[PDB]
Every structure is written in structure tokens, then in C-alpha cells.
Enzyme design. Structure first.
Site, PDB file in Angstrom:
ATOM      1  N   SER A 144       0.827  -1.213   0.000  1.00 21.50           N
ATOM      2  CA  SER A 144       0.000   0.000   0.000  1.00 21.50           C
ATOM      3  C   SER A 144       0.865   1.270   0.000  1.00 21.50           C
ATOM      4  O   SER A 144       1.604   1.497  -0.963  1.00 21.50           O
ATOM      5  CB  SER A 144      -0.969  -0.016   1.186  1.00 21.50           C
ATOM      6  OG  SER A 144      -2.084   0.811   0.917  1.00 21.50           O
TER       7      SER A 144
ATOM      8  N   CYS B 273      -3.729   8.775   5.917  1.00 17.59           N
ATOM      9  CA  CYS B 273      -4.640   8.465   4.825  1.00 17.59           C
ATOM     10  C   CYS B 273      -4.770   9.646   3.879  1.00 17.59           C
ATOM     11  O   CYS B 273      -4.745   9.475   2.664  1.00 17.59           O
ATOM     12  CB  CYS B 273      -6.005   8.057   5.359  1.00 17.59           C
ATOM     13  SG  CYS B 273      -6.011   6.370   5.977  1.00 17.59           S
TER      14      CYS B 273
ATOM     15  N   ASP C 268      -9.698  -5.994  -4.789  1.00 16.80           N
ATOM     16  CA  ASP C 268      -9.115  -5.156  -3.746  1.00 16.80           C
ATOM     17  C   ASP C 268      -9.966  -3.906  -3.683  1.00 16.80           C
ATOM     18  O   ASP C 268     -10.048  -3.157  -4.653  1.00 16.80           O
ATOM     19  CB  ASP C 268      -7.645  -4.830  -4.065  1.00 16.80           C
ATOM     20  CG  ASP C 268      -6.947  -4.011  -2.972  1.00 16.80           C
ATOM     21  OD1 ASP C 268      -7.588  -3.162  -2.317  1.00 16.80           O
ATOM     22  OD2 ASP C 268      -5.724  -4.210  -2.797  1.00 16.80           O
TER      23      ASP C 268
ATOM     24  N   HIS D 211      -7.107  -6.933   0.092  1.00 14.91           N
ATOM     25  CA  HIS D 211      -6.052  -5.924   0.071  1.00 14.91           C
ATOM     26  C   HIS D 211      -4.844  -6.364   0.890  1.00 14.91           C
ATOM     27  O   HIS D 211      -3.755  -5.818   0.743  1.00 14.91           O
ATOM     28  CB  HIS D 211      -6.613  -4.595   0.602  1.00 14.91           C
ATOM     29  CG  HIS D 211      -5.611  -3.482   0.677  1.00 14.91           C
ATOM     30  ND1 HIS D 211      -5.009  -2.938  -0.438  1.00 14.91           N
ATOM     31  CD2 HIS D 211      -5.138  -2.787   1.737  1.00 14.91           C
ATOM     32  CE1 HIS D 211      -4.192  -1.969  -0.065  1.00 14.91           C
ATOM     33  NE2 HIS D 211      -4.250  -1.855   1.248  1.00 14.91           N
TER      34      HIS D 211
END
Length: 264
Positions: free
Chosen positions: A93, A187, A214, A243
């Protein structure tokens, strides 16, 4: 101080070095199940991103960590402090973005990249499908700010994707360990990042690990990465949903990692 601050651990044996770099909502413990498949053949470097719940929140500098380059600085400083001039890098990620940036900053340092749950841009753009409209992620940020626990409980099974209760429980554990304001901040940092323009500058060979579905990474992103990354890029197709395959499908993932890290 840095090595202690980010809980740096080096395990395994050999001269071939592999760095494992985790994504949002986990810490380095997320690698625990795939770890035994690497440590006989590799010297494995694990660390926590500064935003991990397992890192003293005293160290989270909102001004400093306003962009991913600051996270890249940490990664490079760790490898420099360990006197490691060459390694393979596995990033999940946000750590896939960190890896891409790091390989552009220091081409000779990264012999190979393995990208998991990976995207150069999570927001949609005209014809580019990132997975989220601005309004969609703004709704998420609203929910995260309004009630983090409620949001986290809802997000964990979506991220895990497959019906694997133990992985949902484990991901929820570390997701709840994060301070809510830090969670929101990282985030936001991820969602304002756009690496599409610099993918062509990467020269390291790269394996992109794609799962069947995902919630944060459309199926088209892996081929996009293969098309635009400037090194030799292979997409590896993992036959499982979610994910976080290192949590939910560590057996499937480990064999791919073995192949990808056999030689570099």
C-alpha cells in the site's frame, strides 16, 4: 535513535537483503506469517512506519510527515544506518509508493521492488481509475473523524475482503492501535499522492502482486503499473480476494515472494 524509534529488526541470514515495509493500519507484525519463508535465504529488515500504533506517538510530526518523501527519508536513513548498500524491497500500500520514490532517489540501492496492494494514485482522474472519487474518500475521512472505532470496525472486513475472520480480527487489532488523528493524517497524505508522472523514472525490476479483488486497488492498476514503470515489470496473479494477502493468504503470497526474491 532512528533504529530504536521505528522498531527496526533484522532477522535471517545471508548477504541477500530484503526489506519488508508495511501499509496503513498494520505494523511489521503483519509480515509474521510469510517471514519464515524468507529468513533461511535472506537477511530480512523489518521496521514500522512512524504512523504505526507500535511506534511512540511522540514521534509523529504532522508538519514533517505531510508528504511521502518524509517516509522515504526514514527508509533511506535506516538502510544507511545499517550500512546496507543494496537490497530488495517489499512494500504494501503506502509502502509501495515509498518504494517507488526511494528507487528513484537511490537507484543503486534497490535491486528489486515487490509491490503489494499497490497503486500510483488512489483517486480517479479523467479515464484513470484509481478506485475513489474525491467525494467518496471525503465521506471516509468524515467517518474517520466522527467516530474512528465505528469506521474501523466497518473498514476492516472490506480491506481483508475474503471471509477470513482471523485476518479481520488481526487487522482490526492494529487498526485500533493507531491514534485516530494520525490515522486520518496518513490516509490524507496517501490520497493526495500521485506518482503517475514519475513511474517512467523507475529502473529497478518490479513484481506487482495482484489479488482478484481489492476494495482500494482496481484490477486495472497492475497492468497500468506494468505499462508505465520504467524497469522490467511482471504482474503476479494471486488467486485470493483482498487488500492484505500477507494476512489472509500468507501461503499463496509466500511462494510468489520466494520466486520474486530468489535472485536479484
Amino acid at each position: 535513535k532512528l533504529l530504536q524509534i521505528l522498531n527496526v529488526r533484522v532477522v535471517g541470514s545471508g548477504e541477500r537483503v530484503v526489506v519488508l515495509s508495511h501499509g496503513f493500519g498494520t505494523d511489521q507484525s503483519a509480515w509474521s506469517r510469510v517471514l519464515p519463508y524468507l529468513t533461511r535465504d535472506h537477511r530480512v529488515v523489518l521496521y514500522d512506519l512512524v504512523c504505526a500504533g507500535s511506534v511512540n506517538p511522540d514521534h509523529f510530526d504532522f508538519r514533517r510527515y505531510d508528504n511521502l518523501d518524509a517516509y522515504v527519508d526514514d527508509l533511506l536513513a535506516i538502510l544507511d544506518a545499517l550500512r546496507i548498500p543494496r537490497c530488495a524491497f517489499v512494500g504494501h500500500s503506502v509502502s509501495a509508493m515509498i518504494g517507488i520514490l526511494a528507487s528513484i532517489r537511490r537507484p543503486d540501492l534497490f535491486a528489486k521492488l515487490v509491490l503489494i496492494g499497490a497503486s500510483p494514485r488512489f483517486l480517479n482522474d479523467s479515464d484513470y481509475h484509481g478506485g475513489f472519487e474525491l467525494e467518496e474518500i471525503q465521506q471516509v475521512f468524515d467517518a474517520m473523524g466522527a467516530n474512528y472505532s465505528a469506521w474501523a470496525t466497518g473498514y476492516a472486513p472490506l480491506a481483508v475482503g475474503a471471509d477470513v475472520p482471523a485476518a479481520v480480527q488481526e487487522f482490526s487489532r492494529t487498526l485500533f492501535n493507531m491514534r485516530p488523528d494520525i490515522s486520518l493524517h496518513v490516509c490524507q497524505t496517501v490520497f493526495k499522492t500521485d506518482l503517475r508522472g514519475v513511474l517512467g523514472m523507475v529502473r529497478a525490476p518490479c513484481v506487482v502482486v495482484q489479488t482478484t479483488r481489492d476494495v482500494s486497488v482496481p484490477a486495472s492498476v497492475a497492468a497500468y503499473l506494468k505499462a508505465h514503470l520504467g524497469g522490467r515489470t511482471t504482474v503476479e496473479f494471486l488467486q485470493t480476494e483482498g487488500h492484505l494477502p500477507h494476512l489472509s493468504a500468507p501461503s499463496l503470497l509466500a511462494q510468489v515472494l520466494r520466486r520474486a526474491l530468489a535472485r536479484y
